[PDB]
């Protein structure tokens, strides 16, 4: 839903989607050959499949291809300054790809805008959709556009013929959030086969031991997961598959 959305935000009005309560296979993203950029800070994609988080945020928008340089810690320039800022201790991944064939139009596409003027730089993950006329000079522009009085947002003009640095790029930023709460997002967990009738070392759903596993005559209630005897040793288990 994030990566194959039909239309993306303008960068000044960047979307945010919150991900929680699901299994996240980052390596299925990373192995997809699509991406012009896939860059991670504080993590590596293969290790992300081993981690767990309270939420993940996916932020997304379109920018011009040469501006992608600015979507990083410590960067500056109109995108980093006035449109979208990462914190300088960002922990997350930036993904981008060329979308020229979706987002350019033969008559030029002007649906996508960016913030050209602002009083001051954004704070990290701040957003600013305000359309108040920017006073560049001394006159209170009073919601009228003129000599020192500018509309603060400007369109890109994506023609399909643009040079590659001037083509549209779709961008997604993933931020990983760990709080004092249950970690609702995790990488997938691998199962081996069963091996009955041999001495094996086992891990059923976090319950571990060594023993010989064989089909039982006894039957649990539907919510029960393992059996114990009168001595409180584990005498039986339910296969989670």
């Amino acid at each position, epitope marked *: 839903e994030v990566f194959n959305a039909t239309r993306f935000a303008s960068v000044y009005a960047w979307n945010r989607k919150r991900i929680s309560n699901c299994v996240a296979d980052y390596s299925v993203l990373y192995n997809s050959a699509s991406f012009s950029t896939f860059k991670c800070y504080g993590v590596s994609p293969t290790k992300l499949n081993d981690l767990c988080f309270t939420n993940v945020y996916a932020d997304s928008f379109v920018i011009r291809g040469d501006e992608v340089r600015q979507i990083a810690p410590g960067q500056t320039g109109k995108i980093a300054d006035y449109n979208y800022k990462l914190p300088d201790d960002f922990t997350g991944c930036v993904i981008a790809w060329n979308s020229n064939n979706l987002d350019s139009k033969v008559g030029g596409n002007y649906n996508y805008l960016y913030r050209l003027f602002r009083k001051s730089n954004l704070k990290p993950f701040e957003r600013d959709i305000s359309t108040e006329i920017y006073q560049a000079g001394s006159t209170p522009c009073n919601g009228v*556009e*003129g000599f020192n009085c500018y*509309f603060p947002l400007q369109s890109y003009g994506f023609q399909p013929t643009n040079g590659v640095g001037y083509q549209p790029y779709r961008v997604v930023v993933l931020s990983f959030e760990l709080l004092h709460a249950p970690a609702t997002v995790c990488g997938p967990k691998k199962s081996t086969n069963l091996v009955k009738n041999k001495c094996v070392n086992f891990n059923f759903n976090g319950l571990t031991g060594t023993g010989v596993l064989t089909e039982s005559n006894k039957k649990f209630l539907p919510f029960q997961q393992f059996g114990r005897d009168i001595a409180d040793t584990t005498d039986a288990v339910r296969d989670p598959q």
Partner: antibody
Amino acid sequence: QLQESGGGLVQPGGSLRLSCAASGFTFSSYEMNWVRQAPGKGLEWVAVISYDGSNKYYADSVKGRFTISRDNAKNSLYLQMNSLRAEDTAVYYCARLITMVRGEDYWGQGTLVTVSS
Amino acid sequence: DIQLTQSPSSLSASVGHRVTITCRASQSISSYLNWYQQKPGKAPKLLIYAASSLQSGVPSRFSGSGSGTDFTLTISSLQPEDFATYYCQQSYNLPRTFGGGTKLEVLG
């Protein structure tokens, strides 16, 4: 897309109400203008209103007599016309005039008014 | 107030002619001088969104120029739809104001 409406034929000293529906763009973001054109004359600026509607301005012919007003919730501009004059005999255009910053201009098809007994 | 002065009030030309019209403001306005084409009573087509800045989707044969009081619209080679009126309008301050539009009225 812009569509002016409410134009007509009216006596001197009368009143009339123009309207202009906006479609296919974020009307709510922009200064929106009235311009007019008397038959065979050049373009004449009538008035403008801020994006939020907070401020209004006029040319000296229509000043005090008329009012420019907007309903962003309805994507609609208006011109209240009062104390009508031969001056007010024009096609009235509703428009996003661009000024220095790149963006997509819009003009409506214009609504006719004539002032005569 | 600022007032606008299209040096040709009218023109005659033929298809293929490189054409220029010029507009003088009554006072300096930096680069704040738009240009439009109008076919009679039709919605004025913005050509130039400043003295020089050519608008989105406007044909490449059009161009603007100028500074202070003096400005140009040019048509690199005239074509049949260009037998039309042209308006300068100043974008500098209120009241927004238009030139006496140059009518390229002589179709051939």
